[PDB]
């Protein structure tokens, strides 16, 4: 309702979303290197 | 008898005209078609992609 | 070569085929024993193994990552 | 306490167990000393 | 064969060069192998003919060996450096078949890449080669021939 706390801040949840996508990006880079069917990565 | 100091040789084809002999060009032409082929490879079929 | 491998053990001529093949000078099939073409057994041993490990090193690569120099 | 010696050349099948310790270093062979000797006692020289 | 270079991605930020994945890598690795395999393909056998390489100071080197021609060809690509160092490993150990071992490896990566496009895993492909090679070495032992009834040094002459 109108008496609810708005909390004044949407920047924290946006920064957490930017970190989760950045963390899932590199996690999905090495997803195909797991198990006997994994593949090598030459850097 | 000569007009000047030196006389550079003529290139038969025009300067910048690309040309090549042997089996390398026809393989490059086939690989060029296969490069265009790979774009339309997964498109074929009902479950294909746009 | 196939006609040699399939053959009965007891067939001299066919077995011999197992022994000969391509000639690059005259362009016909002649015997290597009379021609003198011969190699060591060690040359083929550990040659396919090196080519096998060479194939394994590139074939297992999925993605390529490059770091620029500092 | 485990040791792994890196070396170029050979095949994967050539890896085998060695009952004793192996030295990664090589001999000098400047004055033409021996390379093989049986029933030898190994002493560790910690000085110059 | 690869065209239309991979787009710089904003969701995956890694320092240095851009990351690229998919079948383009194994296509680029095979394309890098054909860059060196076509060089050594012509200088094979008695009928084969070799080429020249200048050293940028007037000097040059007319080379038949696979280890020497690849030693001067400093390959910047990573996949090509494996075959370059293999020939340096081949000629030091055995000193023979330096051209064939590179040609065998190039043909394997050709058909191996075709098999990956046929949707079988590389682990099954590698298992197929190892069981095949174990039978090949067993077959090499069958077709051996011991030198016998030879006059003098003829077996050492004709094999040279
Ligand atoms: N006189 C010959 N007749 C038939 N085959 C030959 C002859 N000389 C060489 N070859 C073949 O050519 C291949 C490559 O030989 P060579 O070029 O000497 O070795 P490398 O591949 O190490 O350069 C060998 O596998 C061999 O079977
Ligand atoms: Mg040779």
């Amino acid at each position: 309702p109108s008496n609810a706390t708005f909390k004044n801040k949407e920047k924290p949840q946006e920064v957490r979303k930017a970190n989760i996508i950045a963390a899932r990006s590199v996690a999905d880079a090495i997803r195909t290197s797991l198990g006997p069917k994994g593949m090598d990565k030459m850097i | 008898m000569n007009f000047g100091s030196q006389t550079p040789t003529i290139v038969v084809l025009k300067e910048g005209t690309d040309a090549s002999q042997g089996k390398g060009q026809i393989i490059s032409n086939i690989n060029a078609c296969v490069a265009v082929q790979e774009a339309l490879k997964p498109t074929l079929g009902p479950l294909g992609s746009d | 070569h196939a006609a040699s491998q399939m053959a009965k053990p007891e067939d001299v001529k066919r077995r011999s085929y197992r022994n000969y093949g391509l000639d690059l000078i005259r362009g016909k099939i002649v015997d290597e024993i009379h021609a003198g073409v011969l190699e060591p057994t060690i040359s083929k041993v550990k040659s396919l193994k090196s080519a096998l490990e060479a194939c394994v090193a590139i074939l297992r690569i999925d993605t390529m990552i490059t770091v620029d120099p500092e | 306490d485990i040791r792994l010696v890196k070396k170029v050349g050979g095949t994967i099948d050539d890896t085998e167990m060695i009952d004793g310790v192996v030295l990664t270093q090589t001999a000098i062979k400047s004055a033409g000393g021996p390379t093989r000797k049986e029933k030898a006692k190994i002493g560790l020289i910690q000085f110059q | 064969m690869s065209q239309l270079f991979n787009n710089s991605r904003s969701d995956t930020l890694f320092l240095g060069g851009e990351k690229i994945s998919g079948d383009d890598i194994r296509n680029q690795n095979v394309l890098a192998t054909m860059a060196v395999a076509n060089v050594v393909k012509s200088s094979l056998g008695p009928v084969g003919l070799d080429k020249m390489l200048v050293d940028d100071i007037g000097d040059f080197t007319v080379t038949n060996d696979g280890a020497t021609i690849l030693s001067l060809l400093d390959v910047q690509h990573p996949a090509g450096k494996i075959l370059v160092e293999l020939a340096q490993q081949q000629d030091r150990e055995i000193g023979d078949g330096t051209t064939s071992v590179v040609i065998i490896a190039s043909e394997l990566l050709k058909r191996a890449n075709e098999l990956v496009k046929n949707k079988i895993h590389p682990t099954t492909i590698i298992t197929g080669f190892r069981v095949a090679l174990r039978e090949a070495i067993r077959f090499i032992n069958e077709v051996l021939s011991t030198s016998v009834d030879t006059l003098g040094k003829e077996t050492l002459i004709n094999i040279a």
Side-chain angles (χ1 to χ4, degrees):
Chain A
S2 55
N3 301 331
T5 55
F6 178 64
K7 308 184 176 180
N8 200 20
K9 303 296 186 193
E10 294 184 358
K11 188 172 175 292
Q13 60 180 8
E14 291 289 356
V15 168
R16 285 185 289 276
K17 285 169 174 61
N19 300 330
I20 290 157
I21 297 297
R24 287 177 63 78
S25 295
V26 72
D28 296 324
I30 58 172
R31 66 189 170 78
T32 192
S33 184
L34 201 148
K37 302 295 188 187
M39 312 311 304
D40 303 332
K41 305 299 216 303
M42 189 161 57
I43 293 156
Chain B
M1 238 288 288
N2 202 321
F3 299 163
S5 174
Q6 78 301 357
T7 330
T9 190
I10 293 157
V11 187
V12 176
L13 279 294
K14 195 173 183 180
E15 190 175 3
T17 301
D18 187 11
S20 180
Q21 297 293 124
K23 295 146 282 296
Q25 192 67 26
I26 196 175
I27 292 161
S28 300
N29 296 14
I30 290 156
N31 294 329
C33 292
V34 170
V36 175
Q37 193 181 6
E38 288 287 1
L40 302 172
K41 273 281 181 67
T43 303
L44 182 60
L47 274 63
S49 56
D50 298 334
Chain C
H1 274 269
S4 182
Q5 282 195 184
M6 301 172 58
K8 299 174 287 89
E10 29 169 5
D11 197 342
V12 191
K13 180 197 91 289
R14 273 297 163 187
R15 226 100 280 262
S16 176
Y17 283 96
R18 200 174 259 91
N19 304 347
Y20 48 69
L22 212 97
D23 173 39
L24 283 320
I25 292 157
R26 288 179 290 184
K28 51 173 74 66
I29 304 302
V30 304
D31 189 9
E32 62 90 359
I33 291 157
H34 300 288
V37 174
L38 187 67
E39 294 180 326
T41 190
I42 307 302
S43 179
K44 310 309 304 306
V45 169
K46 297 165 66 174
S47 298
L48 300 170
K49 299 181 182 181
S50 57
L52 179 58
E53 297 293 347
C55 178
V56 167
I58 292 92
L59 179 56
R60 296 181 70 83
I61 307 304
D62 186 15
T63 72
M64 187 61 61
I65 292 155
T66 303
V67 186
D68 302 332
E70 190 175 3
Chain D
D1 192 18
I2 305 301
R3 186 180 262 186
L4 278 302
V5 176
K6 301 185 288 186
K7 281 193 175 192
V8 72
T11 58
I12 303 299
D13 189 71
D14 300 329
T15 301
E16 56 183 0
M17 170 47 60
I18 308 98
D19 300 329
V21 71
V22 71
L23 298 166
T24 57
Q25 277 62 230
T26 191
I28 296 160
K29 305 190 289 297
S30 179
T35 52
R36 190 266 189 186
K37 190 170 179 64
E38 192 173 5
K39 57 173 181 295
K41 314 206 308 315
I42 293 157
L44 293 169
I45 297 297
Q46 213 182 5
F47 61 93
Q48 283 74 246
Chain E
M1 62 189 294
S2 299
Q3 51 172 349
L4 301 169
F5 305 110
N6 189 11
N7 181 24
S8 183
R9 298 291 299 276
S10 54
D11 67 331
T12 310
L13 312 98
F14 301 155
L15 178 59
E18 300 178 14
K19 188 174 77 69
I20 170 157
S21 170
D23 300 0
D24 301 329
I25 304 303
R26 61 182 71 267
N27 293 329
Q28 280 181 349
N29 297 336
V30 168
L31 187 64
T33 304
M34 296 296 99
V36 298
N38 299 333
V39 169
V40 307
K41 251 181 170 60
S42 59
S43 66
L44 191 72
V47 291
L49 305 177
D50 61 345
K51 59 185 70 54
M52 309 192 293
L53 300 176
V54 308
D55 303 330
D56 309 335
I57 50 167
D59 301 330
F60 63 97
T61 299
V62 192
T63 169
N64 290 315
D65 187 13
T68 302
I69 194 173
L70 295 171
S71 178
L72 283 82
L73 289 165
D74 186 11
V75 177
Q76 293 290 339
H77 197 259
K81 272 282 184 65
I82 292 156
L83 300 172
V84 169
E85 295 181 356
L86 197 75
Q88 295 182 349
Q89 180 261 23
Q90 196 74 357
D91 66 332
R92 289 187 294 91
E93 291 177 0
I94 179 56
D96 190 69
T98 312
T99 324
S100 63
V101 72
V102 175
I103 289 159
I104 290 156
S106 70
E107 193 68 9
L108 284 169
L109 295 169
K110 280 174 77 183
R111 306 216 179 283
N113 183 21
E114 292 289 354
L115 286 169
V116 169
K117 292 184 287 187
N118 299 334
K119 311 308 302 302
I120 54 175
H121 207 259
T123 52
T124 307
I125 293 156
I126 291 158
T127 303
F129 297 166
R130 289 182 186 285
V131 69
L133 179 57
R134 180 160 56 81
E135 294 289 354
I137 300 298
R138 191 259 183 177
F139 182 78
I140 289 282
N141 301 330
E142 291 182 346
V143 308
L144 303 173
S145 58
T146 308
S147 179
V148 71
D149 300 352
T150 60
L151 180 60
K153 304 179 186 176
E154 192 174 4
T155 308
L156 279 294
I157 287 156
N158 59 356
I159 196 177

